[PDB]
Amino acid sequence: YFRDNGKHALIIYDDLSKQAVAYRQMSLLLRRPPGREAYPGDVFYLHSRLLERAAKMNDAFGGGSLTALPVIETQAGDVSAYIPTNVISITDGQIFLETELFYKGIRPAINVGLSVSRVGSAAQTRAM
Amino acid sequence: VDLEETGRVLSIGDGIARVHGLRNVQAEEMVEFSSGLKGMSLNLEPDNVGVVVFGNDKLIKEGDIVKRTGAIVDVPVGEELLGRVVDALGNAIDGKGPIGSKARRRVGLKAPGIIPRISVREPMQTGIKAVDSLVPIGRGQRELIIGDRQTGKTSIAIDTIINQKRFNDGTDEKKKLYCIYVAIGQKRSTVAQLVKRLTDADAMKYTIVVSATASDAAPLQYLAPYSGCSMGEYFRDNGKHALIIYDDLSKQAVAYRQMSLLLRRPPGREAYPGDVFYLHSRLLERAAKMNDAFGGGSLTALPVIETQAGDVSAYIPTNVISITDGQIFLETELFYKGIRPAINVGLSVSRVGSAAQTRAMKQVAGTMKLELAQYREVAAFAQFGSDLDAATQQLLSRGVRLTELLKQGQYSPMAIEEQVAVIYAGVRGYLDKLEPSKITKFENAFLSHVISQHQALLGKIRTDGKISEESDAKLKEIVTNFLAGF
Amino acid sequence: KTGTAEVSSILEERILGADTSVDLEETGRVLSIGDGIARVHGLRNVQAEEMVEFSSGLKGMSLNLEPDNVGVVVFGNDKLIKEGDIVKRTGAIVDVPVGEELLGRVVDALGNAIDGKGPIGSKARRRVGLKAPGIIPRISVREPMQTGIKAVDSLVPIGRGQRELIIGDRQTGKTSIAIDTIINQKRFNDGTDEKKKLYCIYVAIGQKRSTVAQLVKRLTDADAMKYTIVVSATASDAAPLQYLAPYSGCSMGEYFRDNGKHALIIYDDLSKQAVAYRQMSLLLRRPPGREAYPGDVFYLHSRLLERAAKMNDAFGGGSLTALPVIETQAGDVSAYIPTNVISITDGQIFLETELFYKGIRPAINVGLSVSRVGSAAQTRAMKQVAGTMKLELAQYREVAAFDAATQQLLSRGVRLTELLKQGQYSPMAIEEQVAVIYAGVRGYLDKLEPSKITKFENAFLSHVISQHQALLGKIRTDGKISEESDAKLKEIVTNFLAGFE
Amino acid sequence: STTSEQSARMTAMDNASKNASEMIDKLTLTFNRTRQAVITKELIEIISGAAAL
Amino acid sequence: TTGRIVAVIGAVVDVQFDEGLPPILNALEVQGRETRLVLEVAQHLGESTVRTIAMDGTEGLVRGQKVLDSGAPIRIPVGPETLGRIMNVIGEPIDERGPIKTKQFAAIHAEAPEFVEMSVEQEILVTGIKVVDLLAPYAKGGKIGLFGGAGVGKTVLIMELINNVAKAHGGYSVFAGVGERTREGNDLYHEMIESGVINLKDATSKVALVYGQMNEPPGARARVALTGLTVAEYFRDQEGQDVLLFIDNIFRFTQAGSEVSALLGRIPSAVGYQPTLATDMGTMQERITTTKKGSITSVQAIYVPADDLTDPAPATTFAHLDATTVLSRAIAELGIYPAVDPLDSTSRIMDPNIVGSEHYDVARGVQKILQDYKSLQDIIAILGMDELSEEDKLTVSRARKIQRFLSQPFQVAEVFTGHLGKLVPLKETIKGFQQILAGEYDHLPEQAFYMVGPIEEAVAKADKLAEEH
């Protein structure tokens, strides 16, 4: 609504690893054929269609915008699981929060080695 | 035509008759087919009944007539079974005539509640040092024997059964233990050699062998444990003590899975139905120790489980590990390097613990357990051996002797007092000056010596049930004198 | 429980007594076409696994004979079939043409020519689904099939009538082994020893047509097409065609076998026939099994490979060698279908994908490659040299992860291993193989450099072929290495070695 | 030299043990993932067979 | 009676009857076939329909074809006339020498001996193979298993056992080949004819081959085991004589059932196997037994899919054998042949009472030294072997010597090895292993023991290596 009325919004889904679990429940109870990790094959379109709305409309369309900050949660820090990779291929960046940097008191635990932002230097204050 | 007390088979195949009629048939009731075949009605559906046939479906045509017997499955009981070999329903299969038991019981009765029981306190002597000292088994316990193939589980069970002969041939009445051996899914020749072995040791005058062998239909292998457990509950509920050995409890699960998958029930994990926990829990929860208001009897259980590749995280191994009060691992790596019985004493446990050990065996095994615990955490060095201080050197020189004391042979259980004497010699320190390879000989000699001359000391230990400091000193003297002349 | 034909369009015919007007014995109407499987109502007299012909030229093979309908599989794209189309029998179990006319044609799974050179003028037809010979017709595999690849002919000999199996990861050189084998037989086929002519069949299953076209060009280049058939069921072709291609090829070979001739047939791959079969079964609503493969995916390959036999002399003395090609995933030779086929064949060539980078091409992983027929199907000269060569490699293979004696052993082993490399589409006559193996195994290369044996092999081969062809002819005709021939080889090897540096 | 050699062997085997443990961490995680995948796959095969009939 | 086919799906045919219905396991003959097709009834689906498994390819069946109920299960010829012949699952000959003319027919389905009929005696059966005789001695009348992966030595070993025992046997023999290569069946047939065991002219044959090789549709591979077992049953009971029964393979008897199971309408079990695996195998393995009225010395080769001894099929079979000799691929890679795994082959007569104190002590010593060597290899991986103490370098050397000495050349492997096959009576094996353990051969190289018979031959080979050095 804001994005389409010229304003700027920020939406934080927390977590999207617990929507895909609700969707897997919803599906297996419909008898749909489970796939990899029992997730339905649809479990991508579920997140792709949701996160493809975090757009940035040009000035001929109001100029608004809608940032999105999905929060995924990875068991044992496996970045190569099914849902983490489903979402890593839908988003424009990523912020890895190590659990051993965190346990060292280095907080917030961003793992700057792996974190990246694929718009990055663009849209950054010149001073910074 | 009658469609309440009688019905007619709609279908048959793979041992699962689908009967039409039998409107008044109860669930888990015993119906009878026109061909002299029995069956158990498991699935009651709106349109039909799913009967599991106790036998071969070759004799069950379509359109046959099935008549309900009106009773839940029941088995004979009593001391009329002792020494017989019965099948999963009480029928004799040893060809010694009929069974002639007056009483009967229902296979699917419920376990005693929470108030009838009392904490397990008596020791159930297995006659095996590694078990009787480090992983003791009380009366009323459920001590899983979990292992791989050909590691020595059935031998543990048979040593336990054979040992009780000394108690059953005495006159003390609250030490008599009656054994039941349910043999599930086993080659008949195995059971025949086992019955011969029990006869040899004369341990077949207080044993009931329930036989549900490989050829038997799935329902008989599903039902054998409950038949045995009922024949054992009879002794529990009459002030007597029983000991039932299911061998194995994984093949009952396989037979139950077969029946379920043929009745088309939702598969579940590894294709096991959702009842393979309920199935085993409502069986193993009948091993109790009634208080005095209920007779004081008891019923131990020693379910045997085979684990594929030492995988104890499988479905049924974990189902039966979370139900029981302990477990006796039998690893093969130890079996082949001389340690027989191959009772891995690291993984073995008994949540009952030393609450079920005679005061003498408590006195000695209490420190033997710690000595082996210390040895097990510097075992790796044993190869290096040198290059290490005298502390770990003495640790793993005591551990080796203690280990070689726990070796034992086929069908030769030891009386508790003799186990106490041997472990006393070994742990008090009268063996650390001996080459490990000779330890066994010393044992096999020392034992006999003590049996011959000092029978009075063994009698005092057995009766007092404790190592009085007088007996302690006398035993130290005996050990020192013998060890001097070796 | 709702029958497929318990629809309104059919029950209406039944109710108003009009069913008698149509033929429901040798004809049927498509109830429901979808995903490449038709259900047909009618055809009460259609045989199981019979061929039927739709009303648009497409053919099908009636697999399922259910009580009220027939599950037919279309040998084509069902874009043209419509609910209500008339399906009419063909009368005969599905069969394919055979003969010597196919030789040199890129025929298709059903026997139609897709090379564009005109119709196949064949005469006889064989049912694809025929039983393999019995216990009595066969005899023990005795003749050698010269692969033309040093390693295979030396340490993994293959006889005529033997079912090998070229198993290895993707892109390790299996098709290359197959095409070296096909090209090698050129020397025998261009000759008068009619008992050594071998006719080749290449079944290309689920491979893009560019691959098959390049392969056919490669075969024409070596003019190895005058004696080759190519049964091409490529990826774009419906699943039933890819499932039937191996049987079409196998019957084209059973022809040459049942007429005293010797055939070779190369299925490539069988792991894609299995996939086509799984698709078919799942689309006929047959319950799955492991990895969704139908319950009987072992019988599918066993009944195919069992037809590679070696008939006795009372049955013509023919022969049909089979060289199935399987593709493992990550060297996981312990998968479902690789394990199914590894126990059906007698022998197996293990192409390892790290022998393929460490330098060894062809990647044959000796030690894991076996030939249950064994030395029984080898030439006497090759027997002689291989006896020592295999043993020396076997010793060198346990001291490879590194004295004087053992240092000599390692040197010799590396020399041999460099003598087993080879190029592509350049197979060698058995005489040359034995010549170079003898040169390398006696010790006439114990000093030359490792990196120089690769070129000494080629130079020595050119020298012998250009100077001492009489010796090679004598070895080849005699079969064995005679003492005078051995001395001649000794002289030649020492002479060339001295003047090679 | 003897003292230096023994100190070096102590350090080297300490480092090797730490490397082995740090490798066992990842191998155990992978083993648990693969075990769960195997259970799920076998179960899905069973139930897909059951549904198909 | 007479029914009509109603549905054909794979190897599973449904037949509808209007007269009485044929009980399960009956054999129904399909009318209008060039060659006898027999359908064995397997289910009653209601509505006077029976689901059946075709013993032979169902090519060219038509809905509505007529089927006659034979009235009894598959009946096969038996008697001393089947000796020297070859038979199908349905018993009709396949060696092209005319019909098997017997007086006796037997139904291949029959209950097993009751518990009151079993024997309890056990006497070692010397085979002439060092490893088998030493660590896992066989037994007369016992069931024996050879668990192998692919290409480890099951078939070569069973041919060696045939050669050895069947030739020196007073009684008869039977070789039921269930679903393995036809090349091998022909090879065995010709080997026997050329070795006199079979005899084409006169009646002096001691083997009754039966074959269900892997080109037979699953309905046939799942039954030929019962056919060979019926022939052996007869020779055990009616002839009142000892019998041998080699089966190769006994996995295919399970695999075929798995193949047909799904189409029969059964939910699949753990690993895709039929839910009835355990019982479908017990009802077979419980008829292969000694009894008070005979004796069968059954030997069975058993595929182990992908060398996975925890697979349901081998895992379930392990309980039906009195002795297992687990051939191993790892040992076969070291070139030791037979590949028998000393630390996985077991037996039921390996007791100090049944085989004697010294045999038992030596067998356990061999096993213990090999296990110690296995433990040491872990250390040798890191330290190198020069660092090992001097009580362990001896252990490793002795263990390698024993590994080599367990190998032996067979008479049927002369094609591969070239060596000459040997038989090592029990005393030579026990004496040689006693000596190798005691240390009486620390001065010979280990390679002196590779592929030799008695120990004296190892000494002679060491001398010859030294001389030629």
Ligand SMILES: Nc1ncnc2c1ncn2[C@@H]1O[C@H](COP(=O)(O)OP(=O)(O)OP(=O)(O)O)[C@@H](O)[C@H]1O
């Ligand atoms: N205490 C022991 N001392 C020496 N040998 C033993 C001992 N216990 C068992 N064995 C040996 O181990 C072998 C297998 O024994 P046992 O039958 O008890 O194992 P199992 O687990 O019952 O076998 P299975 O799993 O096949 O039923 C036997 O041959 C026996 O001789």
Ligand SMILES: Nc1ncnc2c1ncn2[C@@H]1O[C@H](COP(=O)(O)OP(=O)(O)OP(=O)(O)O)[C@@H](O)[C@H]1O
């Ligand atoms: N002897 C050899 N020497 C050098 N290169 C080789 C040799 N054999 C095969 N190759 C190379 O390996 C590559 C793939 O070979 P090929 O296609 O025959 O194997 P493949 O496994 O059948 O391939 P795919 O499985 O993808 O069809 C080719 O590019 C070829 O050049």
Ligand SMILES: Nc1ncnc2c1ncn2[C@@H]1O[C@H](COP(=O)(O)OP(=O)(O)O)[C@@H](O)[C@H]1O
């Ligand atoms: N005793 C032996 N000596 C030498 N080689 C052997 C021996 N046994 C098996 N082999 C080799 O291993 C292969 C295994 O084949 P075989 O045992 O016949 O089939 P299976 O796969 O049923 O074991 C043989 O072809 C042979 O090459």
Ligand SMILES: [Mg+2]
């Ligand atoms: Mg047992």
Ligand SMILES: [Mg+2]
């Ligand atoms: Mg290719």
Ligand SMILES: [Mg+2]
């Ligand atoms: Mg074999």
